[PDB]
Amino acid sequence: AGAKDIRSKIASVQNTQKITKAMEMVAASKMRKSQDRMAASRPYAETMRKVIGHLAHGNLEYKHPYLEDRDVKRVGYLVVSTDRGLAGGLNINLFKKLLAEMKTWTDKGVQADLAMIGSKGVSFFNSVGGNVVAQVTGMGDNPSLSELIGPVKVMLQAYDEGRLDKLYIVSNKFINTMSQVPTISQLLPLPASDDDDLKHKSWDYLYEPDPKALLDTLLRRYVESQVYQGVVENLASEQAARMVAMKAATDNGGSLIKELQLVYNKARQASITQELTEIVSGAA
Amino acid sequence: TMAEKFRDEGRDVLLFVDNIYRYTLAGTEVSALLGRMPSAVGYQPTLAEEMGVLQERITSTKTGSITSVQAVYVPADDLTDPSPATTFAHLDATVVLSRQIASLGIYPAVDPLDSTSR
Amino acid sequence: VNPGISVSRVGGAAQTKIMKKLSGGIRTALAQYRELAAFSQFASDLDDATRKQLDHGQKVTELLKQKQYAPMS
Amino acid sequence: VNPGISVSRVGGAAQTKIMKKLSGGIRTALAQYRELAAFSQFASDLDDATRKQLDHGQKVTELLKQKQYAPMS
Amino acid sequence: TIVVVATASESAALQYLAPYAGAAMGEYFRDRGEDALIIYDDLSKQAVAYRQISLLLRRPPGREAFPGDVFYLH
Amino acid sequence: EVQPGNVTVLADTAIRGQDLDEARAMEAKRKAEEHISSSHGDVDYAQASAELAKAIAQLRVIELTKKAM
Amino acid sequence: QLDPLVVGQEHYDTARGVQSILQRYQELKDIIAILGMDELSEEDKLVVARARKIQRFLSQPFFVAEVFTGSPGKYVSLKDTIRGFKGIMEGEYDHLPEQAFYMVGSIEEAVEKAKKL
């Protein structure tokens, strides 16, 4: 105990509570900027997916490896993770979901390969011992596509070279400003579309120079966009998860102030009485 | 004792004590002057008696009644200190006034969440 | 023994010159470890340069531990 | 009535055997139910039977609530 | 039921003696082979009244300024 | 891509090529075969993280507070 | 008497390891109270989980407490207690829940209690 030692700890917890309030404010602004950047990315993927759907599932459906379900013997995951802490359980929730789905796959005896976005995933998977084969880290507030190009390229090359037979992205979906969910989604072979372009019966493109090489480029760019979107959604999920976590930490500090102040009051009362009793009893 | 003379006449009386904590503190000073041993936190040994001898006369009677409104001061913001702890034993109601409610231009600036009555 | 909170005002004057030579790096390693101790609860947020000091100061602290009734020459 | 802190050092010997057999160990169950609902604040994770356990502990705490001057035989 | 009253205005000797009178009334039923129940409505005020009486008699106090006796009191 | 009454240019954000993309994939592979990782640029998070790490260190607040948990 | 020459090395090491991880859990508790558990290292969470399982396994029912709780009293030999604490510390029981260890005798009763939840 000791009245001064307790008051020092009360001050140190108040200082912690103030720091956590500032971190909550900063995260609550970064979340808005990130979730607007998230909306700036939709048109590219939407209009490209309508084109791919016209070339691939419409009239004169061209054949491509990415379109069709060749038999599976090993699987590839692109995993997005943060470079930062204090985000709550977000990355461990995602990595435990991955390790469960990857273990179900390895029950069937298939092998699995990982490519990492962000330093947290690298650290965790190397501690677990996962087979990471490519990585990019230090994206910060500023995720570029021209840095995603690398690991996406490795996983696309491994697919067309015939090694990987299925490709996934593993990411948190931002749904509400206080609700995010870890998800695994299939990138390749291309997901089935719900819509039918039979109403595009009435027209066809003038394909310059030739449709097959153009469909190859379209599919490569689309996989890239879908990965970039998964990175930006995970980044906005990171800002919202940090906001909520710093809110909770500020309330925990505020409760701990009450409990420390009660202990301080008792200590200072006991000190007053033990002194005044020594003085009065000393005077014969 | 003036409020008591109003009571005997059959009326309902209000008695305002502008700071009862200072009544406690002057009892402490007089106790020290008389040379009596100091109690739990230096307060006089007769604290809870000196307080009850005052607060027990403020009662309703089958001739009249005295109600009392007492401004209270809590040393070091400690609701456990013997003076607040002895005073709260007697209070029936508790009205808290807050500057936030006044900055909102709301008068009276009574805080309805902390204001309390048994 | 809690180093750094514990003082000897005699210092090296009461040491063999081999001990006096070797002790200064122990003192500086533990002083740096004490300064960088706070970050230890968030070790894998840190830079590798400070990380090498943090895990060196742990190894010195582990090296000082010693069983009772086994005096060392 | 705060469980866990409150105890009866005479115990079951005071009770009518119907009440003894029916009420068993529930105060210790609430001691842990209170400490665990206090520790596991973030979410109802590891939902093995905690959705039963904690709904039972809520249902019982709600059932023990009683209005004064209404004594139950 | 019997009711024993020692209000807050009354001398501290009455306050701390009041629970022993109540126990002396309960003990009669006890020693006649009957059942009695007794509620002491604040021992923590009995202790304060006894502390007042003890500090007026100049006895050296202990922890929280209570006399050394106080455990024997309860 | 041009349509009846509409046109769109799905522009690339960086120069693309067989070699540039293979060099980027080669660096992405090397960084994973080693265990080399970079530093995020969030200096604000770094400041707040280190202030909170020093502030929370050795409080001794539990056992001082009789919270069991 | 908690010296290796009097008690023997295995007992002494088991008791010191129990003290060491319970102290490390105590040191974690203040940061767990402010930030919450998620921030801990994946090493720190393992020593917290083991320390909590140790804190539960230290409990024991008593033949004289057989009137405050209905549980039968248990007598645990020194061999069985060091065998169980040494088993918990090195993680061979990492898969059981904490409630499997509350108010049991030897560890073979905890493995049974785990089945009944």
UniProtKB/TrEMBL annotation, chain G:
Domain of life of the organism encoding this protein: Bacteria
Location relative to the cell: Cell membrane; Membrane
Function: Produces ATP from ADP in the presence of a proton gradient across the membrane. The catalytic sites are hosted primarily by the beta subunits.
UniProt record similarity statement: Belongs to the ATPase alpha/beta chains family. T3SS ATPase subfamily.
Protein name: ATP synthase subunit beta
Residues of the full protein shown: 344 to 460 of 460
